[PDB]
Write a protein that binds this DNA or RNA. Structure first.
Ligand code: NA
Ligand code: NA
Ligand code: NA
Ligand code: NA
Ligand code: NA
Length: 1043
RNA sequence: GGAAAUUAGGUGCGCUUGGCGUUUUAGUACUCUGGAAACAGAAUCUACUAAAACAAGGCAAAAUGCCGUGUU
DNA sequence: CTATTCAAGCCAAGCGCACCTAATTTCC
DNA sequence: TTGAATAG
């Protein structure tokens, strides 16, 4: 049957709506659900990847320095340097002699923390911030007479500490100390100039951004040329050709020639510049003046500036003409004709200056050119600035039409069209379905990319199961991500409180309880300063409250063409003004004789109302002062493109992808989009539940509303004009009044089919990806009690924070948990006194320090004890963990990491009893082209679960896999507790959190199921991308994961 | 709507670093014991400094060495 | 078992290219 | 949101 497809593309969801194109009856509707592909996910990976390289290279830097000391025999395996103080050694080495153990440790400490190199350039006024820029500037003034080690030693004696925010210095500052130290220590130890050069190098040398990682990395490159070429784009007309450097000579000549060919001169002779004219212009003002003006070109062609038009212009109004960058950059230092008049050479210099990133590399590459350049010239060209970026065309494209630009008057696009050169496009004829590879090409956000890919896959599945639809209407989220979404919600709620407080203010002042039914009119009243905007006459609030029917909410721009139902297109005016106005703009109405005031008097009031705090909306201003003609089709097109349809870049890209696919394969499918503001208006007037608490079905419900919107536009012949623009087809009946507009769209009783629908499907995206986060980062120390139990040791930092009552609750509930309670009890009593004194306050340590300005100090009979920055306390008993004690030699206690992230769990049926084996991410090992589950770890866990060889393997469960526990179907979150056989799940049509809120249930919003002897039945279900359920069957547990 | 250019702003991918943070051990301080002091012993709580480890781990061999939390 | 509790690495500096938005000129 | 321990 012929149907209409509606799509609600969201951050997390894709809702589809399938309704009959004639019967208007809902065929099917459901939601596809998935994780938000927000940028922070990949950012975490890249951040961790970078962190590993830093730690690796820092270590490798040290090992090389130790190797240097080994080869010069200042360090051995027997040589001990434990009790040596680097700060004491580095200071002593600047003046006196050092031991081979004392001098070596000084060099090692320098090599470890070598400081910054790039920030050091510019000073910054200390705005009391802890930024690197301000800190470097701060230390520089303190190092005006002292070396780094001297300053650190002073801080170590005076403040008792060195490490922290203040320990940020320039690399050159450390190097300046190192040289001085090496200069003093040179005579005492047998070293050469190779030793001092090598160490200083090692101390300061770091890879550049264009050098990248070493030889092995898949993120690396072999040279600067390969590096830049892979990054740069390709030509528009020659896809196989790499783009040209932005500031090549022929590139700017191409730019300049286009400027001259676009010029129009009003004179007796030709209006377009002749060849010889452009030649003279190029030679006399373009190759002579860096920034060509309109006067110079006018003086050259012997006309006035006023006769010249069609030139590019800046925001100021000043004419903009192409600057010959390379020409003037080289001319300013070399005026030789051998170089300047060599276009090919200037091209090559431009390429080298742009591709390579350092003066030294420029010099070498320019020298390899074997041109007529002097070495003094080359070393001078290598310091030129601004050579960055690419041209959108290749040199092949530029050189091809360069003669055409000289001798003709056609610009680049005219010539390319004449030469039958069409921009690169992707063919979709060999495609059996809508591709998903092209998505990342025209996308900007990772969130949108996933939502688009899923949306396409939904469409492909729909057209496979239901056939091709005639109409596809799509809506996209207004938010770019969930963080932006919450921000919108907060702003919404804030405005709601303000308006609600405003209403309560009125009902308490006037006593009129009518105010709660006049919110929109009251909101307009305050926004218009109590004045009818069409008559500029005062609107008494008391009269508005008593007689609201005398004041009408009018639409500024008629919705028949504007399709705007928002607050921005609404004004509170007197009923007379709204009647006389009719279907016109304020401009069209106030210009007529039907009005009481002039448009100019109106325009003045609006502009002053649009300025200042609490001003009118900016969109309201553009509406109230609309001076274009409504009946013009071009004007109507702009309103539809803004308020009715969605013309955002992402939307257009996807919409073009679909239209191009259907066009190429000759498939008669009409694709369109719709603004969310209009669908919200429909949902509002069609009387849907304002509180969206039904769960995921709202996405599918929205899609049905969107699909219904498409149906309305095909039914009415007055909407045929607007419907044609939505489908973007080339080219009449129309909506004439406000009343006609309401009759068409506001049809609550005609959409009862949607609300009665109770057959929604749901599809949750299953995550089977190996090698995600294996474990939490935090390292934990352990202790053993008298019972022989191993206990986890936790830290309690930030004791002096305002809203931190962790210590307060800890002492009140379990004082014995503190390690301070057992060891050093005198300090504990000192803390208890502070705790007992501020029991009313949230954080006793906060209120204490907020008054005395002093912190809690360790007990000392001389009142000189150290400050307490954090407190250790015993946590839970150690169980599931990762033992990494071996990384710490002679450690008295275990050192562990916690939270072993589960990959999946395999359910076994063992002698009428359901059991399962938990597969951890740590248990999945990567190989060259595939991931394998550790067979030793699997059998081990299979033994720790009392699984027998007789047991029957049921199924494996990953995240968002559908599991049916005792007749109840859930979706899998993951293994919550391996030892206790507890897995966490969630509901399918809704979140369990919201499910409890609707039921007003105060229980903790987590569903934990226990797989034990009481467990009766376990079945694995699954869905397609549409949400159609089906049961599965398997023979053995999957061990090989292809990735 | 599309082509090129100028300016301003924005997004992503990738690269290069900085100073922190967690943990162990050692030293010191703090606490306890003895002593006239020196110092020794105990404790490992609190702080400071150094060295080392920091997703499990896998390559690599004198290296500005390399991979391991993303997408599909 | 249910109901409850705890806690989970972080800031700052620079660079390359790709893409997008807005404004301006020409043409297709 | 989620590993996972813990009181009852
Ligand atoms: Na490329
Ligand atoms: Na550059
Ligand atoms: Na008038
Ligand atoms: Na950027
Ligand atoms: Na807890």
């Amino acid at each position: 049957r012929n149907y209409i497809l509606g799509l609600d593309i969201g951050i997390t969801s894709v809702g589809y709506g399938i309704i009959d194109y004639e019967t208007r009856d809902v065929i099917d509707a459901g939601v596809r659900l998935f994780k938000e592909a927000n940028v922070e996910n990949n950012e975490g990976r890249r951040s961790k990847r970078g962190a590993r390289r830093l730690k690796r290279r820092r270590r490798h830097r040290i090992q090389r320095v130790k190797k240097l000391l080994f080869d010069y025999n200042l360090l051995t395996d027997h040589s001990e340097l434990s009790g040596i103080n680097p700060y004491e050694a580095r200071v002593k080495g600047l003046s006196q002699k050092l031991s081979e153990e004392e001098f070596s440790a000084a060099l090692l400490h320098l090599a470890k923390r070598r400081g910054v190199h790039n920030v050091n350039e510019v000073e910054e006024d200390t705005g009391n911030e802890l930024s690197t820029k301000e800190q470097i500037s701060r230390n520089s003034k303190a190092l005006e007479e002292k070396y780094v080690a001297e300053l650190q030693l002073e801080r170590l004696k005076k403040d008792g500490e060195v490490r922290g925010s203040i320990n940020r210095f320039k690399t050159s500052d450390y190097v300046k100390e190192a040289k001085q130290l090496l200069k003093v220590q040179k005579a005492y130890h047998q070293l050469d100039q190779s030793f001092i050069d090598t160490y200083i190098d090692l101390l300061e040398t770091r890879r550049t951004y264009y050098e990248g990682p070493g030889e092995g990395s898949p993120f690396g490159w072999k040279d600067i040329k390969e590096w830049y070429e892979m990054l740069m784009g390709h030509c528009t007309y020659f896809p196989e050709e790499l783009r040209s450097v932005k500031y090549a000579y022929n590139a700017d000549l191409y730019n300049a020639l286009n400027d001259l060919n676009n010029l129009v001169i009003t004179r007796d002779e030709n209006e377009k510049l002749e060849y010889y004219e452009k030649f003279q212009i190029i030679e006399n003002v373009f190759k002579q003046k860096k920034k060509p003006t309109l006067k110079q070109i006018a003086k050259e062609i012997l006309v006035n500036e006023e006769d010249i038009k069609g030139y590019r212009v800046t925001s100021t109004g000043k004419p903009e003409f192409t600057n010959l960058k390379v020409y003037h950059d080289i001319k300013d230092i070399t005026a030789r004709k051998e170089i300047i008049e060599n276009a090919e050479l200037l091209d090559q210099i431009a390429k080298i200056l742009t591709i390579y990133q350092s003066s030294e590399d420029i010099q070498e590459e320019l020298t390899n050119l074997n041109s007529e350049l002097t070495q003094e010239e080359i070393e001078q060209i290598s310091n030129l600035k601004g050579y960055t970026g690419t041209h959108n065309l290749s040199l092949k494209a530029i050189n091809l039409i360069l003669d055409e630009l000289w001798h003709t008057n056609d610009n680049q696009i005219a010539i390319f069209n004449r030469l039958k050169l069409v921009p690169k496009k992707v063919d979709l004829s060999q495609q059996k379905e809508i591709p998903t590879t092209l998505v990342d090409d025209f996308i900007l956000s990772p969130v949108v990319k996933r939502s688009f890919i899923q949306s396409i896959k939904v469409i492909n599945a729909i057209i496979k199961k239901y056939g091709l639809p005639n109409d596809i209407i799509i809506e996209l989220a207004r938010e770019k991500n969930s963080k932006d979404a919450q921000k919108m919600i907060n702003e919404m709620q804030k405005r709601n409180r303000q308006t609600n407080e405003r209403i309560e203010e009125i009902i308490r002042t006037t006593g009129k309880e009518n105010a709660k039914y006049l919110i929109e009119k009251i909101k307009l009243h305050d926004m218009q300063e109590g004045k009818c905007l069409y008559s500029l006459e005062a609107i008494p609030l008391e009269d508005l409250l008593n007689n609201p029917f005398n004041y009408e909410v009018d639409h500024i721009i008629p919705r028949s063409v504007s399709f705007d139902n928002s607050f921005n297109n609404k004004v509170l005016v007197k009923q007379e003004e709204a009647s006389k106005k009719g279907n016109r703009t304020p401009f069209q109405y106030l210009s007529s004789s039907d009005s009481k005031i002039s448009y100019e008097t109106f325009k003045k009031h609006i502009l002053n109302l649009a300025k200042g705090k609490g001003r009118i909306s900016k969109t309201k201003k553009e509406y109230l002062l609309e001076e274009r003609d409504i009946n013009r089709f071009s004007v109507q097109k702009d309103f539809i493109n803004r308020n009715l349809v969605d013309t955002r870049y992402a939307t257009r890209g996807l919409m073009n992808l679909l239209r191009s696919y259907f066009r190429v394969n000759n498939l008669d499918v009409k694709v369109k989009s719709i603004n969310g503001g209009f669908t919200s208006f429909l949902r509002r007037k069609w009387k849907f539940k304002k509180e969206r608490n039904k769960g995921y079905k709202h996405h599918a419900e929205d899609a049905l509303i969107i699909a219904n919107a498409d149906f309305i536009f095909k039914e009415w012949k007055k909407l045929d004009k607007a419907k044609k623009v939505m489908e973007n087809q080339m080219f009449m009946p129309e909506i004439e009044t406000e009343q006609e507009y309401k009759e068409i769209f506001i049809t609550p009783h005609q959409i009862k089919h949607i609300k009665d629908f109770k057959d929604y499907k749901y599809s949750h995206r299953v995550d089977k990806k190996p090698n995600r986060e294996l474990i939490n980062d935090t390292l934990y120390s352990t202790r053993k009690d008298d019972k022989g139990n191993t206990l986890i040791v936790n830290n309690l930092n930030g004791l002096y924070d305002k809203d931190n009552d962790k210590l307060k609750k800890l002492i009140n509930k379990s004082p014995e948990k503190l390690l301070m309670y057992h060891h050093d009890p005198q300090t504990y009593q000192k803390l208890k006194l502070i705790m007992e004194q501020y029991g009313d306050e949230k954080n006793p340590l906060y209120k204490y320090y907020e008054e005395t300005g002093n912190y809690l100090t360790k007990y000392s009979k001389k009142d000189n004890g150290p400050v307490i920055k954090k407190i250790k306390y015993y946590g839970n008993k150690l169980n599931a963990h990762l033992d990494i004690t071996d990384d710490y030699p002679n450690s008295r206690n275990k050192v562990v990491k916690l939270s072993l992230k589960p990959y999946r769990f395999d359910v076994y049926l063992d002698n009428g009893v359901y059991k399962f084996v938990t597969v951890k991410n740590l248990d999945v090992i990567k190989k060259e082209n595939y991931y394998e589950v550790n067979s030793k770890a699997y059998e081990e866990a299979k033994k720790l679960k009392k699984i027998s060889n007789q047991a029957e393997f049921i199924a494996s469960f990953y995240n968002n896999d559908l599991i049916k526990i005792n007749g109840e179907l859930y979706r899998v979150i993951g293994v919550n507790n391996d030892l206790l056989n507890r897995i966490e799940v969630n509901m399918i049509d809704i979140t369990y959190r919201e499910y409890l809120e609707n039921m007003n249930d105060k229980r903790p919003p987590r569903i934990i199921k226990t797989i034990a002897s009481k467990t009766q039945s376990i079945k694995k279900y699954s869905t397609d991308i549409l949400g159609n359920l089906y049961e599965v069957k398997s023979k053995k547990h999957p061990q090989i994961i292809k990735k």
